[PDB]
Amino acid sequence: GARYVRQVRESDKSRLVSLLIHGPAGSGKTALAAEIALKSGFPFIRLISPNELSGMSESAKIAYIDNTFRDAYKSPLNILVIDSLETLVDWVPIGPRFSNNILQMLKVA
Amino acid sequence: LKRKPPQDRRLLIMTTTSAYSVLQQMDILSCFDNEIAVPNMTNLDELNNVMIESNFLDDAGRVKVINELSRSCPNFNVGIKKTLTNIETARHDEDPVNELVELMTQSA
Ligand SMILES: Nc1ncnc2c1ncn2[C@@H]1O[C@H](COP(=O)(O)OP(=O)(O)OP(=O)(O)O)[C@@H](O)[C@H]1O
């Protein structure tokens, strides 16, 4: 994580770096991501979590996501933590059921 | 069910269910920190204890019904709710052992 942070800091052509942190349930992924982000020491850091979106409607959620991603296009250095991707799209394996709108929005974001 | 209370508050949640398999299929069994189990009645002495507590046996009835169901039913498994309902409905007509025996045999 520290190496990736340094690389994004220094390189002048790599203007977008994305990571995936996958593993078995209960393994402690969010703690590690938060630790890396904190120790990085960047001016601008944000986090998107399921807790913040509870009770809202689909349009409100999309609006919130778009606003948060737009707030990050200022300043010359930024960090964003997206938590538990699969529960942001309301996944359940019986159908399977999920939300195509939010998924497509994230895929384009 | 996985949100911590603000500041320094505390919370205990107890949720019941009867469709464990469905919850397993929905993949929602990771929100719980432990799992208690409640089994059925599986013995005659337990039925006797329920009877003494419900004021129905009158001693002789206890003996007659227990003796009848000892050989009239090899396997016995019923919940408390249905047992209490069966006792109550048996009380009205033919307080003798017969009615309870039929009710218990058919219910099990
Ligand atoms: N590398 C680590 N070393 C020590 N403790 C850790 C580590 N990573 C996580 N933890 C501990 O794990 C707990 C939090 O777990 P965490 O939410 O990160 O788990 P998770 O598997 O990502 O969660 P979820 O089940 O919601 O997907 C805290 O007690 C935290 O200290």
Q: Which residue in A59, A48, A60 sits closest to A88, CA to CA?
A: A48
- Which of helix, strand or coil describes residue A76? coil
Amino acid at B30: S
Question: Could you tell me if A4 and A17 are in contact, meaning their C-beta atoms sit under 8 angstroms apart?
Answer: yes
Q: Show residues of chain B in contact with A94, CB under 8 Å.
A: 25-26
Query: Distance, CA A109 to ligand 1 centroid (Å)?
Result: 27
Question: Could you tell me if A40 and A5 are in contact, meaning their C-beta atoms sit under 8 angstroms apart?
Answer: yes
Q: Which residues of B38-61 are buried (b: 16+ CB within 10 A; e: fewer)?
A: eeebeeeeebeebbeeeebbeeee
Residue A94 contacts B, CB cutoff 8 Å: yes
Rounded-to-10 torsion of CA B96, B99, B101, B104? -140
Angle CA A98–A70–A68, to nearest 5: 55
Which ranges of chain A does DSSP label H, i.e. alpha helix?
Answer: 2-10, 29-40, 58-71, 85-88, 100-108
Which of A94, A97, A98 should we substitute to test contact with B (largest number of B Cβ atoms within 10 Å)? A94
Q: Is the CB of A26 under 6 A from ligand 1?
A: yes
Residue A46's beta-bridge partner residues?
A80
Residue A82's beta-bridge partner residues?
A48
Residue A79's beta-bridge partner residues?
A45
Copy the structure tokens of residue B106: 């058919």
Pairing of strands A79-82, A45-48: parallel
CB contact under 8 A, B25 and A25: no
Question: How far apart are alpha carbons B94 and B96 in whole angstroms?
Answer: 5
Contacts of B89 (CB under 8 A, 6+ apart): B103
Q: At A92, give phi and psi (nearest 5°).
A: -150, 130
- Tell me how the structure was determined: cryo-EM
Q: Which residue in B39, B102, B41 sits closest to B73, CA to CA?
A: B102
